Design an enzyme around this catalytic site. Structure first.
Site, PDB file in Angstrom:
ATOM      1  CD  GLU A  31      -3.088  -0.978   0.238  1.00  0.00           C
ATOM      2  OE1 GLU A  31      -3.197   0.147  -0.449  1.00  0.00           O
ATOM      3  OE2 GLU A  31      -3.823  -1.914   0.055  1.00  0.00           O
ATOM      4  CG  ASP A  61      -8.143   3.853  -4.572  1.00  0.00           C
ATOM      5  OD1 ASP A  61      -8.647   4.417  -5.614  1.00  0.00           O
ATOM      6  OD2 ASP A  61      -8.750   3.055  -3.894  1.00  0.00           O
TER       7      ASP A  61
END
Ligand SMILES: [Cl-]
Length: 162
Positions: A11, A20
């Site tokens: 991440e 994202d």
């Protein structure tokens, strides 16, 4: 290696609101803020989450707090899930890690949907499950990551994370 390090790798860490892979507003360590297209709405959510007027930026510490909370919620989600719990209980420690990752990335519901893969996981048919789980939007959108998770699932070791 452990779940935290693993997810930290998958991440990244960003102290500023960002988008994202799917275009959603996110921050810290993969913490989704909102699926809304509004930066404001995201700033709103962010402040509520942190408890202060952030102005779209947080500290490392704040990021880590969100992360702890998220990892915790993922495990609990699993344990509270009728489809997921039994799979999880049947797995070894590395593999459980892989399940938590998927759940952290896609949501309990999301993962609970991989009916066929879950069955194979439970039957301990590693290779089949690896193949099956790859036939998914998830793999097609974030293949490199997916690949690391699948290898972990398949082999039961941390190799992919070297
Ligand atoms: Cl990727």
């Amino acid at each position: 290696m452990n779940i935290f390090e693993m997810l930290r790798i998958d991440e990244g860490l960003r102290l500023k609101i960002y988008k994202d892979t799917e275009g959603y507003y996110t921050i810290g360590i993969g913490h989704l803020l909102t699926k809304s297209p509004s930066l404001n709405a995201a700033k709103s959510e962010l402040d509520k989450a942190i408890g202060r007027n952030t102005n779209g930026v947080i500290t490392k510490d704040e990021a880590e707090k969100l992360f702890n909370q998220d990892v915790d919620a993922a495990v609990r989600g699993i344990l509270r899930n009728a489809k997921l719990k039994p799979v999880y209980d049947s797995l070894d420690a590395v593999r459980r890690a892989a399940l938590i990752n998927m759940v952290f990335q896609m949501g309990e519901t999301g993962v609970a949907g991989f009916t066929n893969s879950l069955r194979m996981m439970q039957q301990k048919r590693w290779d089949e499950a690896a193949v099956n789980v790859a036939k998914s939007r998830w793999y097609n959108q974030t293949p490199n990551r997916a690949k690391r998770v699948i290898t972990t699932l398949r082999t039961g070791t941390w190799d992919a994370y070297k």
